[PDB]
Amino acid sequence: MIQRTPKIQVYSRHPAENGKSNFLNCYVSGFHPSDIEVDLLKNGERIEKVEHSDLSFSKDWSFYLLYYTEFTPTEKDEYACRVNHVTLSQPKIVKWDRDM
Amino acid sequence: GSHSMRYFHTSVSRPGRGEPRFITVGYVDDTLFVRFDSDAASPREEPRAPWIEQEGPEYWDRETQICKAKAQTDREDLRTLLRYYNQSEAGSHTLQNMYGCDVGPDGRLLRGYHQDAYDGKDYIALNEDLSSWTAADTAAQITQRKWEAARVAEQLRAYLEGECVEWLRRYLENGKETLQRADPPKTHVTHHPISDHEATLRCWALGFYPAEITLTWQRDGEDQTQDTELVETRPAGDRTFQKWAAVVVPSGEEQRYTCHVQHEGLPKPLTLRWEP
Amino acid sequence: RRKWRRWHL
Ligand code: NI
Ligand code: NI
Numbered sequence: 001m002i003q004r005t006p007k008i009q010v011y012s013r014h015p016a017e018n019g020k021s022n023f024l025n026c027y028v029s030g031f032h033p034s035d036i037e038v039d040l041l042k043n044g045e046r047i048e049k050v051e052h053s054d055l056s057f058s059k060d061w062s063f064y065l066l067y068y069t070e071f072t073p074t075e076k077d078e079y080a081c082r083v084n085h086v087t088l089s090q091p092k093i094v095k096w097d098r099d100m
Numbered sequence: 101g102s103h104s105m106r107y108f109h110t111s112v113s114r115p116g117r118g119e120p121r122f123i124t125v126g127y128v129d130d131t132l133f134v135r136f137d138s139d140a141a142s143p144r145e146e147p148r149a150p151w152i153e154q155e156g157p158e159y160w161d162r163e164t165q166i167c168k169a170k171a172q173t174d175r176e177d178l179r180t181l182l183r184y185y186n187q188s189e190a191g192s193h194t195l196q197n198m199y200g201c202d203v204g205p206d207g208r209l210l211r212g213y214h215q216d217a218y219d220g221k222d223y224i225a226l227n228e229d230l231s232s233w234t235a236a237d238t239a240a241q242i243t244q245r246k247w248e249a250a251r252v253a254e255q256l257r258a259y260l261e262g263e264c265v266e267w268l269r270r271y272l273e274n275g276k277e278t279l280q281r282a283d284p285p286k287t288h289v290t291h292h293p294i295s296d297h298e299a300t301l302r303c304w305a306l307g308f309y310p311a312e313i314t315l316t317w318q319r320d321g322e323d324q325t326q327d328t329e330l331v332e333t334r335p336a337g338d339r340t341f342q343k344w345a346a347v348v349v350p351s352g353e354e355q356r357y358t359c360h361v362q363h364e365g366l367p368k369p370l371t372l373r374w375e376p
Numbered sequence: 377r378r379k380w381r382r383w384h385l
Binding site for chain 2: 380
């Protein structure tokens with residue numbers, strides 16, 4: 001079967017400012033089949049109550065989903081997205097970089 | 101400007117785990133405005149934009165009836181596709197469908213769409229004439245023969261030329277405060293040293309709507325397509341989008357590079373430089 | 377709004 005691995009971007013809704021409430025986004029796109037597992041991590045721990053968009057897809061039929069949660073960035077707290085998909089031999093972790 | 105309405109549908113079978121999951125969403129341009137998920141407690145089509153909330157209970161009842169009928173049709177069609185491809189009942193498979201219309205600035209039909217895919221690949225598509233079909237393989241040709249005998253194309257053409265464009269125009273009017281407003285990108289150029297020898301120039305576009313945008317880097321007036329990392333445009337989560345384009349430049353040469361930004365919300369294209 | 381008619385594969 002046609003299998004396409006996900007593209008992953010982790011980023012904030014607004015430019016990050018320490019101590020200011022914001023939204024942490026994990027956008028996964030370009031993938032097939034649609035079954036996918038996405039976690040947002042704070043210092044390596046799963047954030048609870050993450051929200052996500054409803055499954056939709058691009059012209060080439062590949063799927064995309066937005067996962068997101070409110071968060072207040074600080075100088076020291078590390079955030080990341082963890083994605084698992086059949087095309088991946090182990091879950092992929094992408095760290096939030098506030099400059100990307 | 102010109103505008104689009106699209107309905108997207110995905111059914112995913114899951115043998116041993118009940119009936120297929122069915123999810124459909126509707127968009128006008130890049131604005132999500134309705135959704136239905138079969139795994140919701142007591143599933144109904146739900147509004148996702150404020151200008152659709154004013155439709156009356158008859159609207160939501162008819163939409164929900166349609167979503168449920170489409171889910172049921174998909175459930176049977178997934179079983180049919182097992183037969184057409186000689187596949188086992190034990191695996192998960194995917195059926196996707198998109199349809200909808202584009203209208204021009206005068207509100208007239210520019211193009212209609214209706215296409216289906218199985219397991220991520222083209223299955224059958226209504227051609228742009230809205231009268232003939234492109235079947236991807238000998239399985240889809242069976243569907244094409246059935247849909248030709250049933251004059252399906254003529255029926256889709258009547259919807260796409262009629263109701264599709266008439267309701268899209270109604271939505272554009274009722275949601276004009278947002279659907280007919282372009283939000284231009286907020287832009288800046290950032291500088292990130294990579295070493296003593298070079299540094300990244302990243303050209304940002306934030307907060308823009310609709311998603312269509314062009315970011316290009318130039319060195320002394322010539323495009324840097326070769327050297328440009330362009331990310332895929334991505335949703336901010338508040339209806340707007342983000343994108344950036346980056347180039348690695350020799351340190352001290354930053355003033356040779358300009359970022360060119362074109363977007364429907366801007367008066368004229370922007371030319372940005374790194375400003376320390 | 378959505379189309380009323382659909383047809384089996
Ligand atoms: Ni317009
Ligand atoms: Ni039937």
